[PDB]
Amino acid sequence: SLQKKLKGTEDELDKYSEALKDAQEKLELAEKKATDAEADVASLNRRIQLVEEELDRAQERLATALQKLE
Amino acid sequence: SLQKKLKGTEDELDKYSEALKDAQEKLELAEKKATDAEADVASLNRRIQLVEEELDRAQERLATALQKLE
Amino acid sequence: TTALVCDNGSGLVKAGFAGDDAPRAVFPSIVGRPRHQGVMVGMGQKDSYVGDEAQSKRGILTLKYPIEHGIITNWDDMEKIWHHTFYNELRVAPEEHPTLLTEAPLNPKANREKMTQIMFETFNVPAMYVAIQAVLSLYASGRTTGIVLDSGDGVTHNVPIYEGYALPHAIMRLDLAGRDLTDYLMKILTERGYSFVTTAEREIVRDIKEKLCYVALDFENEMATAASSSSLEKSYELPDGQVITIGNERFRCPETLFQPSFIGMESAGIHETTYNSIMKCDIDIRKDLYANNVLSGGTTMYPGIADRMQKEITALAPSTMKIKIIAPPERKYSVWIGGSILASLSTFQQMWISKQEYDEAGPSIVHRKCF
Numbered sequence: 001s002l003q004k005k006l007k008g009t010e011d012e013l014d015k016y017s018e019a020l021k022d023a024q025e026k027l028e029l030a031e032k033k034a035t036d037a038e039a040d041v042a043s044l045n046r047r048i049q050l051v052e053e054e055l056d057r058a059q060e061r062l063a064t065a066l067q068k069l070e
Numbered sequence: 071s072l073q074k075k076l077k078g079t080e081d082e083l084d085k086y087s088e089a090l091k092d093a094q095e096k097l098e099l100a101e102k103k104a105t106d107a108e109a110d111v112a113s114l115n116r117r118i119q120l121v122e123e124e125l126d127r128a129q130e131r132l133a134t135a136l137q138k139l140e
Numbered sequence: 141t142t143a144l145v146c147d148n149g150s151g152l153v154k155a156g157f158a159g160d161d162a163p164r165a166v167f168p169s170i171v172g173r174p175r176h177q178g179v180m181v182g183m184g185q186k187d188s189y190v191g192d193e194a195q196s197k198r199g200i201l202t203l204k205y206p207i208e209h210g211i212i213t214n215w216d217d218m219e220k221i222w223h224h225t226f227y228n229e230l231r232v233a234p235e236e237h238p239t240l241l242t243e244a245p246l247n248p249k250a251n252r253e254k255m256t257q258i259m260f261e262t263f264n265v266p267a268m269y270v271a272i273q274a275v276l277s278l279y280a281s282g283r284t285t286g287i288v289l290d291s292g293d294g295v296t297h298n299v300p301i302y303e304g305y306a307l308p309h310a311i312m313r314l315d316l317a318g319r320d321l322t323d324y325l326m327k328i329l330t331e332r333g334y335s336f337v338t339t340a341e342r343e344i345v346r347d348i349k350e351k352l353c354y355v356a357l358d359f360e361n362e363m364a365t366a367a368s369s370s371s372l373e374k375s376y377e378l379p380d381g382q383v384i385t386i387g388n389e390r391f392r393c394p395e396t397l398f399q400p401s402f403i404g405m406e407s408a409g410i411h412e413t414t415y416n417s418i419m420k421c422d423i424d425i426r427k428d429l430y431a432n433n434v435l436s437g438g439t440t441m442y443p444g445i446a447d448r449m450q451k452e453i454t455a456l457a458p459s460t461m462k463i464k465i466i467a468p469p470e471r472k473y474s475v476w477i478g479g480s481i482l483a484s485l486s487t488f489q490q491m492w493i494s495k496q497e498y499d500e501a502g503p504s505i506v507h508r509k510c511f
């Protein structure tokens with residue numbers, strides 16, 4: 001009767017509480033991963049310009065050397 | 071006598087279900103953001119490796135130019 | 141007055157008013173019919189369901205695509221799709237709105253002839269025009285040169301354009317598209333133990349492909365990684381629960397674009413077709429074409445596609461050349477944006493096909509200078 005439904009509702013509530021805790025744990029892990037990736041991309045995208053200017057002046061004095069050789 | 075208990079149980083179940091639904095919605099949001107960030111960082115890491123090879127060969131033929139100019 | 145830009149495409153109709161930033165109405169180009177009998181009396185369900193409506197009743201209906209590869213097979217359902225687009229999604233009578241349509245390269249002339257005849261007779265639009273998808277895509281990007289690869293759901297074509305001058309002899313068309321990729325995914329998922337046969341489940345497989353698939357920069361290394369690591373497997377939730385998992389098939393499906401031999405096609409991969417098309421052009425314009433490679437179409441939305449394409453083309457092209465690939469975020473809507481821009485030009489107002497001009501010149505006028 002109503003007792004069976006009440007017990008089932010309580011037990012289901014317990015499983016959903018466990019799932020809620022698992023969800024919070026997974027989101028904490030996801031946020032940690034997201035901030036780590038943010039730091040990594042910050043490093044990469046603040047070194048990309050250095051690499052770009054590096055290859056830029058590399059081909060610059062490459063061209064200068066080639067024309068002088070010619 | 072048990073009617074109040076059932077009403078309280080129903081209210082608690084509703085509150086827990088709403089909190090759980092918020093937990094999911096937020097978890098999906100965080101997971102989507104994390105996946106997008108991971109894809110972007112992987113793509114720009116591949117860019118990093120290809121530009122690194124470009125720079126390496128840049129110094130290579132720059133050195134070649136250097137001696138041939140010598 | 142105002143102009144109306146409609147893109148039938150294949151598998152996704154997108155329509156709107158000219159001058160808008162984005163299409164107003166976007167919905168699958170699907171017509172479905174009920175294959176069961178139905179016992180309830182007074183429900184009064186109509187015979188056919190068109191557009192996104194048919195999507196919501198997927199389980200009871202059977203779906204038919206009026207477009208197989210660019211061309212139109214069934215015309216009555218195509219007329220139904222056009223009527224639904226004009227009257228329900230836009231809620232505008234086409235009796236006073238010029239219509240611009242998009243049409244893929246290298247298709248039967250009868251297709252254009254019947255399209256114009258239907259539009260001029262059934263709907264009596266004051267005027268209409270037909271344009272190539274590649275040119276519109278180039279318009280949207282703001283470029284004026286460069287080779288454009290448009291990969292939709294029906295056909296994938298490369299069209300090189302330089303200084304606004306197309307090169308018809310270098311246009312390359314390949315029938316590999318998103319529909320074939322979905323079919324290959326359906327065929328390959330049977331290996332893991334999941335069987336999809338009903339046309340309804342084709343949509344589920346398409347959603348899986350859209351939301352889960354990705355392109356691998358290198359194939360053999362990724363296969364080796366997947367053979368040992370388990371960090372690639374991902375889980376998807378079907379409409380009725382019953383979560384499924386997918387591993388290698390995550391990146392095997394898109395590889396068909398670079399490896400047509402998977403599905404038995406003789407032709408070469410899209411990268412090789414692009415390189416061959418570039419080489420088919422002259423020698424004084426290859427610099428801009430190499431440096432202004434443009435991508436468009438829904439199938440191009442695979443993450444990591446640009447990196448793989450650049451790597452392949454660089455491996456093919458000479459090292460001295462600079463290879464750049466343009467991948468705007470709004471690839472799949474680029475064609476409609478280009479069409480909207482084109483329809484809004486002042487100089488385009490005299491290039492429409494008028495009603496009485498159509499009547500006196502006959503349906504074939506579409507093939508005259510009013511291309």
Ligand SMILES: Nc1ncnc2c1ncn2[C@@H]1O[C@H](COP(=O)(O)OP(=O)(O)O)[C@@H](O)[C@H]1O
Binds near residue numbers: 291439441
């Ligand atoms: N993000 C995505 N991932 C995978 N496939 C996609 C994505 N976006 C669109 N598609 C594919 O593109 C197709 C739609 O192409 P679309 O841009 O409508 O061109 P057309 O209308 O000419 O077919 C769909 O069949 C779909 O499978």
Ligand SMILES: [Mg+2]
Binds near residue numbers: 292293437438475
């Ligand atoms: Mg298209």
